[PDB]
């Protein structure tokens, strides 16, 4: 999130990204290019590792942009702690995963910036609501 009247925030793949499948053309519809965010972009994706990369865009109408990289979405960073890939067709009380108490503080060293709280406990009770969205148990 930035400013408005011409911006788009997506969560790119990892490794390759140039075509149109993910969101490739959606940003061209609202103004974009092919030579600015493909190779002269994957400098960060080659470093961030893999999975998903919540990097966004900001249009100016002249190939300029505020390519503010972000931290992997709390939907994926949780598949790392438990293991499952999806989460659950429908959350609730049954789920194919498990996440102990300090299991949610393992990601506290990942998500720390713009969350809102600098500390670890005033920002973990936020992801505990995300542990009732995909489903992932809280071993207690």
């Amino acid at each position: 999130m930035k400013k408005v009247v011409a911006v788009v925030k997506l969560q790119l793949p990892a490794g390759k990204a140039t075509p149109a499948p993910p969101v490739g053309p959606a940003l061209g519809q609202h103004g974009a290019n092919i030579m600015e965010f493909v190779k002269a972009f994957n400098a960060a994706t080659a470093n961030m590792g893999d999975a998903i990369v919540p990097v966004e865009i900001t249009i100016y109408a002249d190939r300029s942009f505020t390519f503010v990289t972000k931290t992997p979405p709390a939907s994926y960073l949780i598949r790392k702690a438990a293991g499952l890939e999806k989460g659950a067709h429908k959350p609730g009380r049954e789920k194919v995963g498990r996440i102990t108490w300090e299991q949610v503080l393992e990601i506290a060293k990942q998500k720390m910036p713009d969350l809102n709280t600098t500390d670890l406990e005033a920002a973990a009770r936020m992801i505990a609501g995300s542990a009732r969205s995909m489903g992932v148990e809280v071993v207690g």
């Binding site: 075509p19 149109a20 499948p21 053309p25 061209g28 519809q29 609202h30 974009a32």
Partner: protein
């Protein structure tokens, strides 16, 4: 050796569809196309079909280079530790097969096989009697379930008509290619000299789609009229609007009744007639939409064969693909997977 042909059966579809995905992925990146609610959706399904054409060409160039370089047939340490790495990556090679089998408009449901004899008379029915148990073991080996809907003998020897219903998941797609006229050439047992003779027999295949029987004509599209009765009677035939005319508006058919002297018994008697004449002209279309929906290969004549079985010189000739198998007495047991594999490539390869 059973891996150089299947890895290439998706290699001819690469440039045919690869150069086509570009003149389609280059229309979405321009918003000027989105002004069409449906023409921008029609372009996004074929663009979404870049999911079976941009995933396979990714997990198919690693199964041809990561296996054909350090594969010694001499028991080693890097060879039997490399077989379980491709044993579920060759058990997965069926994912590229079912994509040319599950694409029929109705290959899921159970199928219906009609094995009818043809040219060759007395012998030709023995042929259909042999092809019947040939398809019987086949659908009993794969695991499917049989229902003999009809079987009927006849005069000398063979079989007159055989109609069977075979179930199981994706059954029609498996017995759809075996739809034609199968020729046989062998020494005639019903002859004194034993001369070499030829026999023809037809095999039809049709899935089990619709089943119910209901035509509730709600009086929503009916235009009933009440004209004054005609003929005998008295003051009452002149003055009472006895005669009635039920008019079927979405069709054009009009039935009339004047048998009785009442209107409520004549419009009801005119519906016991309109329902009848409909029950024949609404089923005549389920017989005319199904007499051109089967196909065309059924002359049974000399020159319309899909596969030839000859036990004289001992071989099987698939006239569609061109193959010549040498085990005829073995194909007559149910081993059909392979010629069905090929008939589902030759058939759905021209469309």
């Amino acid at each position: 050796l059973a891996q150089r042909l299947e890895g290439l059966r998706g290699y001819l579809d690469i440039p045919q569809k690869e150069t086509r995905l570009k003149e389609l992925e280059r229309r979405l990146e321009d918003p000027s196309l989105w002004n069409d609610p449906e023409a921008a959706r029609k372009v996004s399904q074929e663009a979404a079909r870049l999911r079976r054409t941009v995933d396979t060409f990714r997990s198919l160039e690693s199964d041809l280079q990561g296996l054909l370089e350090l594969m010694e047939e001499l028991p080693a340490e890097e060879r039997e530790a490399l077989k379980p790495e491709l044993e579920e990556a060759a058990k997965k090679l069926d994912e590229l097969y079912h994509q040319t089998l599950l694409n029929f408009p109705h290959a899921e449901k159970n199928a219906i096989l009609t094995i009818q004899p043809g040219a060759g008379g007395t012998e030709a029915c023995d042929w259909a009697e042999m092809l019947l148990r040939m398809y019987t073991r086949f659908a009993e080996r794969q695991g499917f379930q049989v229902e003999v809907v009809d079987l009927t003998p006849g005069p000398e020897a063979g079989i007159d008509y055989a109609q069977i219903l075979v179930k199981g998941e994706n059954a029609y797609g498996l017995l759809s290619p075996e739809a034609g006229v199968h020729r046989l050439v062998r020494p005639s047992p019903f002859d004194a000299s034993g001369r070499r003779h030829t026999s023809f027999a037809g095999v039809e295949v049709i899935p089990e789609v619709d089943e119910e029987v209901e035509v509730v004509l709600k009086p929503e599209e009916l235009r009933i009229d009440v004209m004054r009765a005609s003929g005998p009677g008295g003051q009452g035939v002149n003055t009472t609007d006895s005669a009635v005319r039920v008019v079927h508006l979405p069709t054009g058919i009009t039935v009339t009744c004047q048998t009785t002297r009442s209107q409520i018994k004549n419009k009801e008697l005119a519906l016991k007639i309109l329902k009848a004449r409909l029950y024949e002209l609404e089923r005549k279309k389920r017989e005319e939409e199904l007499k051109a929906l089967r196909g065309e290969v059924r002359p049974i004549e000399w020159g319309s064969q899909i596969r030839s079985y000859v036990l004289d010189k001992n071989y099987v000739k698939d006239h569609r693909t061109g193959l010549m198998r040498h085990d005829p007495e073995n194909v007559l047991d149910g081993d059909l997977m392979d010629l069905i594999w090929a008939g589902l490539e030759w058939k759905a390869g021209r469309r």
